[PDB]
Design a protein around this ligand. Structure first.
Ligand SMILES: NC(=O)[C@H]1C=CCN([C@@H]2O[C@H](COP(=O)(O)OP(=O)(O)OC[C@H]3O[C@H](n4cnc5c(N)ncnc54)[C@H](O)[C@H]3O)[C@@H](O)[C@H]2O)C1
Ligand SMILES: Cc1cc2nc3c(=O)[nH]c(=O)nc-3n(C[C@H](O)[C@H](O)[C@H](O)COP(=O)(O)O)c2cc1C
Length: 364
């Protein structure tokens, strides 16, 4: 089983290639990492396995879900350290995903009820709804388009949050540049209607993700930085006229960051739409992997069978699993043994109970 051949991710000697994908679960009450997160990540930690945390706030204005953890306060750093310590005691590697939602927010999640920020003033359309703190769904509002100075301020929020993650003991961070959130709002030409140096050409639309990655690389070292993108996923009205071209343009920038800095990133992590994985039971994921000089993590609809094939065929070095890892704490062992998998319950994906639907999925 090629998922269980060892893989060297930079300095980390991973014992297998099954990765916990980052997933928002909304158990970090009032944005403080809770003891429940410690139990949840400990359940899923394995010796030599790689874990990526749920998306984590980089600033008071970066959230678009309730009770998502932050890492922009020293208090949050203190609580994360206890979670990281428990995961490390099980021999796992863990990166903190740094997440700014951009226009995918709501007055209820913003300080003083202010407008969410974005590359544009266009809102997400009404065919997407936002989860509210009381469990209902609301309307995405009009965002405020930020200028170049404020862009540099958001870049500094990523930098400070990366330093805080290292202070908490994380082995690295992952830049969330996918799924229609703030970075993707600069990448995707269906969203980026700017006419300044951050809009228009592929080079200009890639400016923001390049500045973010460069800032964190210069703060904590390239080896501790992973980057996640999703050029073909249209979540939250985030469409590009040429996803392959946009994806290659991003890979181009990452390769050059690595050349200039003198060190490779931890990895590039790409999610594909779930319908692509269903058809495999496309060439986009392989094309990005072939173009990127370093470690490649594939994600999006993967199964045990599709994961094995991805690694065997050379389509990826690592395979991250989301929904199956929610309901299977010991997903790694179930995949090793080809054991049955627990069904996952979508109703408790984003609820606040520290146990129900979170840590009470049973082991084999
Ligand atoms: N990146 C994040 O923070 C995730 C938050 C929500 C769901 N994520 C992704 O959005 C896409 C659509 O999610 P779903 O189908 O669950 O739609 P919802 O708006 O959650 O209802 C999928 O690629 C999924 O993996 C992204
Ligand atoms: C409930 C839920 C929360 C998620 N939260 C995040 C997130 O915070 N950051 C991120 O990059 N992706 C997030 N994702 C997407 C997953 O990381 C991953 O790409 C996806 O679940 C992989 O497909 P799979 O569920 O078929 O394995 C989330 C997905 C789900 C279902």
């Amino acid at each position: 089983n090629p998922l269980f051949s060892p893989y060297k991710m930079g300095k980390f000697n991973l014992s297998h290639r099954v990765v916990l994908a980052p997933m928002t679960r909304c158990r970090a009450l009032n944005n403080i990492p809770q003891a429940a997160l410690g139990e949840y990540y400990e359940q899923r930690a394995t010796a030599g396995g790689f874990l990526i945390t749920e998306g984590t706030m980089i600033s008071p204005t970066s959230a678009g879900f309730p009770h998502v953890p932050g890492i922009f306060t020293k208090e949050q750093v203190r609580e994360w350290k206890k979670i990281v310590d428990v995961v490390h005691a099980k021999g796992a590697v863990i990166f903190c995903q740094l997440w700014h939602v951009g226009r995918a927010s709501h007055e209820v999640y913003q300080p003083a009820g202010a407008a969410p920020i974005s590359s544009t003033e266009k809102p997400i359309s009404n065919r997407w709804r936002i989860l509210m703190p009381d469990g209902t769904h609301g309307i995405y509002p009009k965002p405020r388009a930020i200028g170049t100075y404020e862009i540099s301020q958001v870049v500094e929020d990523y930098r400070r949050s990366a330093l805080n993650a290292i202070e908490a003991g994380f082995d690295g961070i992952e830049i969330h540049g996918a799924h229609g959130y703030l970075i993707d709002q600069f990448l995707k030409d269906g969203i980026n209607d700017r006419t300044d140096e951050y809009g228009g050409s592929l080079a200009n639309r890639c400016k923001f993700i390049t500045q973010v990655v460069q800032a964190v690389v210069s703060a904590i070292g390239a080896d501790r930085v992973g980057v996640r993108v999703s050029p073909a996923i249209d979540h939250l009205d985030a469409m590009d006229s040429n996803p392959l071209s946009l994806g290659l343009a991003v890979v181009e920038r990452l390769n050059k960051i690595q050349l200039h800095s003198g060190s490779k990133l931890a990895y590039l992590h790409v999610t594909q739409p779930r319908y692509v994985a269903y058809g495999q039971t496309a060439r986009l994921m392989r094309t990005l992997r072939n173009a990127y000089q370093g470690t490649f993590i594939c994600s999006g609809g993967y199964t045990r069978e599709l994961g094995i094939e991805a690694v065997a065929q050379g389509d990826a070095d690592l395979v991250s699993y989301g929904r199956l890892f929610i309901s299977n704490p010991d997903l790694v062992m179930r995949i090793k043994l080809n054991a049955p998998l627990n069904k996952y319950n979508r109703k408790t994906f984003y609820t606040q109970d520290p146990v129900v639907g979170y840590t009470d999925y049973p082991f084999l």
